[PDB]
Subunit: 327 residues, 4 copies
Amino acid sequence: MAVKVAINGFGRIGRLAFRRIQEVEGLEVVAVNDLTDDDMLAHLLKYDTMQGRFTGEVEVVDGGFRVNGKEVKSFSEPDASPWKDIDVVLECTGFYTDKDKAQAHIEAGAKKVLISAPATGDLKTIVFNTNHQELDGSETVVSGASCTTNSLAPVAKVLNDDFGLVEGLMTTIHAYTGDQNTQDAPHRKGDKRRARAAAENIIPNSTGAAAIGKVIPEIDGKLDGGAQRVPVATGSLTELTVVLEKQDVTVEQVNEAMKNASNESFGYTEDEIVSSDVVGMTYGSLFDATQTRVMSVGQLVKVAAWYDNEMSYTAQLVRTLAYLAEL
Amino acid sequence: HSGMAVKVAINGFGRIGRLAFRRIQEVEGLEVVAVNDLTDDDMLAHLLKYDTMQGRFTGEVEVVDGGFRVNGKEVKSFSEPDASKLPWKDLNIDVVLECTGFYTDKDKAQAHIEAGAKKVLISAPATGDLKTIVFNTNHQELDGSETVVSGASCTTNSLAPVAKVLNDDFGLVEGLMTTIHAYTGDQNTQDAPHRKGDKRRARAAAENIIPNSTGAAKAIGKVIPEIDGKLDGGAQRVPVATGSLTELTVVLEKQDVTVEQVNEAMKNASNESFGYTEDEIVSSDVVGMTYGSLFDATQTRVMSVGRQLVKVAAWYDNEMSYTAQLVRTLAYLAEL
Amino acid sequence: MAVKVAINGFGRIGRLAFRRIQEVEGLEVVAVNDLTDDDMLAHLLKYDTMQGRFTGEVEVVDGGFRVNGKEVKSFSEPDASKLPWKDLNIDVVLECTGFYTDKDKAQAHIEAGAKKVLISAPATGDLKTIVFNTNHQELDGSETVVSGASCTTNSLAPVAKVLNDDFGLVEGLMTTIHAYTGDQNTQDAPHRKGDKRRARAAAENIIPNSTGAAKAIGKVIPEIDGKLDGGAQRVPVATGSLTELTVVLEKQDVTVEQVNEAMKNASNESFGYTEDEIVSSDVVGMTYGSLFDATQTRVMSVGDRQLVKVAAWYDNEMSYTAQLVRTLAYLAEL
Amino acid sequence: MAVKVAINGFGRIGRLAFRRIQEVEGLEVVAVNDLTDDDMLAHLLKYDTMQGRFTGEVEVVDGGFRVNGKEVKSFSEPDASKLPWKDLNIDVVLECTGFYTDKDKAQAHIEAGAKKVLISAPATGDLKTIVFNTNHQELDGSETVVSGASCTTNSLAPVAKVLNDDFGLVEGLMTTIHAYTGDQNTQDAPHRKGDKRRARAAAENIIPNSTGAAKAIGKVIPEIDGKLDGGAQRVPVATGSLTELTVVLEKQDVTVEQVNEAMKNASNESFGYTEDEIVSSDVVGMTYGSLFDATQTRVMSVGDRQLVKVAAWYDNEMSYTAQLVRTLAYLAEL
């Protein structure tokens, strides 16, 4: 009733968007596509290890399930012919990370696709409250960027706008994700590092986030970095070390600039929080003023922002979805 | 060893498959000539070389044309979902170590035989009318004419030598088991759909106590016929990457027992498969051990009720303990 | 009567009882004792790894800290006999340090000027051990020291009671698979009680452990005294625990559903029921003292007998704490 | 030439130093001081969660303490200076309690009649700070109190030395992703040493934390004094850590392989080199003080000043311990 959504892939992101959508007025879910029975889908929506119990009546039917009395239709699998009989699709499989690949939901019936991942090809990449006003309403396929990109973009925008961003290096200390292995095991993408026991290791990994030029064109090329995946099930931290144009910067100046640009996607804190404190939060990024460092030898600037790589990213995606569907 | 050798093929190069491979390198004599799994050589070689719980493989692993070389010996590798296309006939495989978890059935494992392997040893409990073997409890029920054989489970290997002693020395009336078990690779990293419809095993493995069914106690009569139907129980999966505990609480015929008699009777049954300790150890102290079961004398108590009951507990490395037992049974079984 | 509560030892139970007492009209925490500064106390009340952010204003004022405008006095006095409890008109101390778990020893608080002590753990001596909604009406209000029992005892008692009342309990064996606690060690190190197993890295081991919950169940349910035994394994989850109980019942041909139904039918503010296949993290933050899991019910033959296994989840933190504050309020009301 | 050692504080570092010393010819332990009984000490030397079983006979036979037949004396004396050092046959006391991390404070061991103290931690006052194979040749044998630096400093120093010697170091930022340690708490709970972040459940959080390693690097490598800064994130692995370093260098046109090759060319027993894509648990038990990981080198170039990123692994237990025992042996040749 206002904005109708199909979710393809009822994984961590798919389920959290479902929950998120239940708290956002004007947005509904009408269909869910995944390869598993309804009972399993209902069960995994109801119970969440990190995010807690879904408050709300879930009960299973044949062609889907009921949530608070609203039926949701359930389907199965990828490409070839499943929506002929939606306002926007949330692509969540992690297997349409490409433009012509995600050109399949279009053929299938739905107006717009919001891809819950970075994607290749000729599409806009959107971080909400950094560059959503770039959306004009004619797009068929849109990337919602990554979790790390949504943590980094508002921070990078301020640094550039206020002090001039010359260059920067990032490290993200990142919760382990579902595409990592439980035990040491062959990995599908040939990543020898993600093949390892997720909850027992510090695992170095690549990330595309630092592709920031797709969200903030004016700093394209200026950033790089990577990830270290560690044994927390959700909640992550992005450290950013930069050279700035404006050479006489102080800790409080950077902190004040961050505070001044806060909004519902970009929070600010001066408390001495740890990763589990950000679990379930709805800012896409939470700037941590306690971690700001300026390094002078006659400057390098370091900053850190927290994000729940689940709910932070999800909240941002549902915001982009809503803005995409008021189109 | 060449044409000489007892040729082992490993199907499924997971935790059990790689550990079996390591054991076989150690033991020597028999040769892993082929490995099948659906991934490239570089991944296989890397995962053999580095191991989160079990430590660095000592010895040279290098990626060559047909597969990989371990300490100069070429191992052939294949990427094949259907095991009946496997070139077992061409390589004259003697035993396929079936470790994929997808062929845990007498009939199903026959695919390997069609492909040309003489014998299959399944690294898990299996249905139907096959022999289920715990080394040093019942490996001698084998005669060398079997084509498909089960190596039982990790839990069953921890339990059987304990149960045997209780029955032989005191008479087992009835008993309850709980195994607090390390999480396994078929469990999910994050909350997601499980491959076999299991809602519990569907949950984040490293963040939950997860109730789980095990056949170990009910199917103990496959290994120890004289106590068929006398045990039951289940499992809880918990956030340790390996290392497991079996608790067993039993009623004995002798109603005049002591902690000392029980511990003494366990002690005097020790072998390579059944260890004994008197130290208050924890799960991480059994990582990498090659006993199939380690009896922990510090946990024995004699309780009364209304009725004398006896509680005992045995540690196992559900990985290396099981694997050591499997390779013992494999060595015994290439034959006749 | 807004009854005045002092909390001694502002650890996991301490802080959680504080959060619960916010939702109880006519209980107000006026003092907190722990050996640390105000800033640390206020921070740890605000942020909680497993239980989530405290909603409401916490601010460090000069003499202690303010929660939603109400001042809470703080002290860091290691010797409980020295606390200014007379001076502050304390009715009841929630004794949560783990160092006064004895009737005579908890008397120190009475010495200090407090009227009653409720100990957040099993205790020895001449006092009552109370599991709310199983035996709290043993309290007549003349008690000066009371034990709130254990987390495990609270999970087990309503289950045991139903088995006994409806089927007759002959004997029973319990295992609790238990979250690791604060008195456990981060790394291998010496342990206060001399426990060589609690000495070990808590988040890296299955750790066998003694519990009195099954043996001392006769303190809470006299009619089954001596009928249960069992132990615990501490495992690497930060909170959320399970109690398995296997028993012999004085009733023939009992089905899984018949046991399940009798549990459901006894359900109240302390005893919940579920028919979903949940896991430990699903009970984090729940306020039932025990949650019966109908999906883990089995009826097995072991040799000419039927053994019935049941399982009950508890959040060894919030479940216990909810039970404790119920008992605290009941005691206050009398 | 058979160096005799007293270990004060039989914690992680103390026990590992004990073990390490059993593999090093010419060095032996004669006394251990900690506040706990022999049985607990023997038990914790025998079994180790991360480092594995101690091979070798440990017995509390006869209410004493024996390792492979050699008796080790144990004391339970919290008053360092009340220790029997002026009796007893010592060459060096290893101070591992974390409570004497100051030149004057560590003098208690000397007043007790001791001769030399080696502190297993950073320390204040007028003493030399030593990272073996970076600045040990600064030791002349006349020092009474010496600091063995930190785990992080030992991982960082050989990396920083090569960057400076070969490329010129202008400035640099460090982050160490660090295993949690035993002074961290198991459950959110007040920390005595009131760190609001180390107060939090160690195995369930990413915990930001200060380290002196970058700022105090000038104590080990004087020519780069003031050129480095950074901090730590404590994460849920029980041991094994990583140090990332991002630097501006003097030699502007540097490449990944050049930095890598320079690192390789400086390797020795304290400083290792790897080109495999390993993870933390692969360094558990290793005896290099620092292991350079060539797979993680990054050069960032936009036509300003180049940023170079490098990472070195360390087992914050055994790496540090191996370095400490090398410094112990060396101090004891001079």
